[PDB]
Structure 1
Amino acid sequence: GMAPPSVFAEVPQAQPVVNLGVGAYRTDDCQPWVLPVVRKVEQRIANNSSLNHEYLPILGLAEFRTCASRLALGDDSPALQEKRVGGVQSLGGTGALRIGAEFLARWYNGTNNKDTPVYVSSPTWENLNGVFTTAGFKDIRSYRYWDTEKRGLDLQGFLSDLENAPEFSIFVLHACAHNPTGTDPTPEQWKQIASVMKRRFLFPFFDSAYQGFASGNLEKDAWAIRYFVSEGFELFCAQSFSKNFGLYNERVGNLTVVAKEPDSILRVLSQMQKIVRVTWSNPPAQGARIVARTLSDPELFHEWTGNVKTMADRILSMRSELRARLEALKTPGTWNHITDQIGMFSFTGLNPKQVEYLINQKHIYLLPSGRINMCGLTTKNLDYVATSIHEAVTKI
């Protein structure tokens, strides 16, 4: 020993974590797309020399928080009229989930109760377990969701897992465009889910990362959140603007809180502020400024809804086209899930074996789960993808 040992000497190397594996919108030319409305608002911001760079409030830009919560809940939401809604600007949807998880691990179902079960879908967003584990929750559980045989929602399994969940358990619910399956409950199925959650005092923590982006219509995509509000639930909703505004790298999110009465919102937000202060202090301005300007100008809002529907329509086109080509190519199995599914992501129903074939024989890159991003499909590669799927299904 010649030298003093490094304090990092034992740090482990963390485990490593046509392209159908993208996780962001792409055009038919395989390119990123800055939304036209975003470019317009960025120019207005750049031309406004009165804007300064002083710290935003801990909880964020007030106009953004109000507009974001209105987007999720609806302008005429009774919860908004009754002043029992709070909004915390966050670092994307991830930051909203994290702040909400930190709050619940400190103040929900007792004080510092790390034992409340947290239920996530099987499968779910890959980062969700880490967010809740880091907040201190010791008991993360799964609810049945994807049915591999029917290629759709295992409603009876989901319902049984709700019925068997301890009272006050937290359920993380994808509000629409479930990631990674693309399979959402219908409104009637949502009503059954809500009924069990109401009876068993289960806490809805909605993750709304694809509102409007999902189906092309922002109002339809928020229906489940608004239904839970109308049924009298208190809930959280972690909103991301990464996908529906294409503002991935500006880290724009909002945590909406719905409580029974206004005083509870004040106390909850006061604890939120403490959590934020020691995490990022206060949030960045640029992306929230873009969203606030867009949502508070009816002309910009209308332009934005058009841009969102353009993205959804290109995806809906790729879904309709892929299913038609697979059905035209005498492909075994049912493929109505390709168009029943909603959003960018689709569980194709292909086992890893069929997946390895597409990566090493045909050089389509997709995840072992069979998840594809429909934004990786184009008018130019569709017939090649569809044919290669037909070979993966009939040969391997």
Structure 2
Amino acid sequence: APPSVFAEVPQAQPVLVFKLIADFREDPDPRKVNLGVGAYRTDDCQPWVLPVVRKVEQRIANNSSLNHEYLPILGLAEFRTCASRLALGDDSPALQEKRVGGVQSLGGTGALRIGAEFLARWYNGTNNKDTPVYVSSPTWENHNGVFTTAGFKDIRSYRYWDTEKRGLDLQGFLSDLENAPEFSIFVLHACAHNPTGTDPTPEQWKQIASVMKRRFLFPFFDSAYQGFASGNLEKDAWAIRYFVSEGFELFCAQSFSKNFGLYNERVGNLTVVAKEPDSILRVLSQMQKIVRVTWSNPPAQGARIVARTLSDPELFHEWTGNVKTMADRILSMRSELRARLEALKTPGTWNHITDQIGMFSFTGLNPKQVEYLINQKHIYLLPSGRINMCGLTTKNLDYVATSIHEAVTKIQ
């Protein structure tokens, strides 16, 4: 009897956020509510394909001049240019000086992967897998997984969330920067921090930038929610743009999954800013090799939609309107969920619910409370106490606020 070559493969733990989408879908209880994955939902609790996207899909579908031939390894040129322009702004001195590069990627995740793979080979030496990599405490789980997979052995965290203050621990963060070895890589959330929903103010960003510049720390921005932090694309990109004006060289992993609602078309872009043009050229050539052995070349549908919307003043205007619409609904739900919790006179303060920005809220519930909420009330969320505000609708608001109350009460 010959045994199987897969006999010893262990059962892996499940990617939780996707594990719950499954549990939710198949859960038969009617009063179930998915406050899990960070995807927008209308007030009717439905996915929303943006009107502008619908528009363009139709145009693309009626364009017979378009073929399916392979795209360049680095991706659709028009897309890479518009994506980078969106984050840096058209008046960017970096764009003017041609020291900006863009690599089309598979969502923000793919962009993060490509940048980590490049750094692990050409940054701070050759194949230097030892440069420390810093992620916020807490942060999006996949930050660790992505950098670990790229080979970095030393992943550290910088203090960010202050539990006994329910906000940003600036001194902690600043202290961690001061103490970070020179050349260390810092993974920064450009805006709408995940999972806290707490971002530094421009004044704090200035302090953060000041230490980074002094200690030659590398800013690797994750920008997955441009436009959600406030509803304004220009505003949500200010930090990245400030670093650029300060002369930093940096990476910016861009995702169009949430702001274009193109979740399943995997549209991402890795923007690179260098001190001089010649370097962008050499960098992209190394990036081509990395891409070639990962996905060979990127898919066209998503990039085509984003490219057409961003290069047509009319589609662009319209898109900015749809974005603001989503952001506005998140602001509306924050005020409501807070009201109800106060009316129910729920133990403790809950101002933070309206203080945090973006799609998420770091509620503050112990895990035992989350288990109660998921098992008893069928209100799916993460163990950490993070909730997707978009999951709230004028309907289920009371059920949730009730459940959160009962929890806090007969659970604490």
The TM-score range, normalised by the shorter chain, is: over 0.9
Selected match of 1:48 from 38, 63, 88: 63
Q: Name the counterpart of 2:137.
A: 122
Root mean square deviation of aligned Cα: 1.1
Selected match of 2:272 from 251, 257, 278: 257
Distance 1:363 1:5, change over 3 A: closer
- Give 1:361 deviation, angstroms: 3.4
Tell me the alpha carbon deviations over residues 5-64 of structure 1, each in whole angstroms, 9 at most, x when there is no partner.
221111111113x22113211111111111100010011001110001111111000000
Tell me the alpha carbon deviations over residues 301-342 of structure 1, each in whole angstroms, 9 at most, x when there is no partner.
001011111111111111111112222332232222111111
TM, length-normalised to structure 1: 0.97
Q: Is the 8 A contact 1:22 1:376 kept in 2?
A: no
- Give 1:149 deviation, angstroms: 1.5
Q: Name the counterpart of 2:391.
A: 376
Q: Does 1:89 align with 2:104?
A: yes
Selected match of 1:337 from 349, 352, 359: 352
Question: C-alpha distance in 1, partners of 2:56/2:375?
Answer: 44
Question: C-alpha distance in 1, partners of 2:38/2:170?
Answer: 27
Q: Is the 8 A contact 1:348 1:372 kept in 2?
A: yes
Question: C-alpha distance in 2, partners of 1:359/1:88?
Answer: 40
- Which moved further from structure 2: 271-280 or 386-395? 386-395
- Give 1:243 deviation, angstroms: 0.5
Question: C-alpha distance in 2, partners of 1:357/1:274?
Answer: 49
Question: C-alpha distance in 1, partners of 2:389/2:383?
Answer: 16
Tell me the alpha carbon deviations over residues 170-213 of structure 1, each in whole angstroms, 9 at most, x when there is no partner.
00000001111111111111111111101000000000000013
Question: C-alpha distance in 1, partners of 2:370/2:59?
Answer: 46
Selected match of 1:266 from 281, 293, 296: 281
- Give 1:214 deviation, angstroms: 2.8
Question: C-alpha distance in 1, partners of 2:248/2:66?
Answer: 39
Tell me the alpha carbon deviations over residues 100-159 of structure 1, each in whole angstroms, 9 at most, x when there is no partner.
000000000001100000000111111111111111101011111111121111111111
- Which moved further from structure 2: 339-348 or 60-69? 339-348
Identity of aligned residues (%): 100
Q: Name the counterpart of 1:184.
A: 199
Instruction: Flag structure 1 segments of 5+ consecutive residues without an equivalent.
Output: none
Q: Is the 8 A contact 1:171 1:205 kept in 2?
A: yes
Question: C-alpha distance in 2, partners of 1:278/1:389?
Answer: 47
Tell me the alpha carbon deviations over residues 347-374 of structure 1, each in whole angstroms, 9 at most, x when there is no partner.
1011113323323333322221101000
- Which moved further from structure 2: 105-114 or 362-371? 362-371
Q: Is the 8 A contact 1:144 1:157 kept in 2?
A: yes
Secondary structure of 1:282's counterpart equals: coil
Selected match of 2:93 from 78, 82, 102: 78
Tell me the alpha carbon deviations over residues 80-113 of structure 1, each in whole angstroms, 9 at most, x when there is no partner.
0010000000000000000000000000000110
Secondary structure of 1:283's counterpart equals: coil
Secondary structure of 1:105's counterpart equals: helix
Instruction: Flag structure 2 segments of 5+ consecutive residues without an equivalent.
Output: 15-32
Question: C-alpha distance in 1, partners of 2:163/2:383?
Answer: 14
Q: Name the counterpart of 2:13.
A: 15
Question: C-alpha distance in 1, partners of 2:167/2:344?
Answer: 22
- Give 1:388 deviation, angstroms: 2.4
Secondary structure of 1:395's counterpart equals: helix
Question: C-alpha distance in 1, partners of 2:52/2:228?
Answer: 15
Question: C-alpha distance in 1, partners of 2:270/2:371?
Answer: 39
Matches within 5 A, 1:1-396: 3-16=1-14, 18-396=33-411
Question: C-alpha distance in 2, partners of 1:392/1:156?
Answer: 33
Question: C-alpha distance in 1, partners of 2:293/2:378?
Answer: 45
Question: C-alpha distance in 1, partners of 2:178/2:12?
Answer: 37
Question: C-alpha distance in 2, partners of 1:73/1:100?
Answer: 18
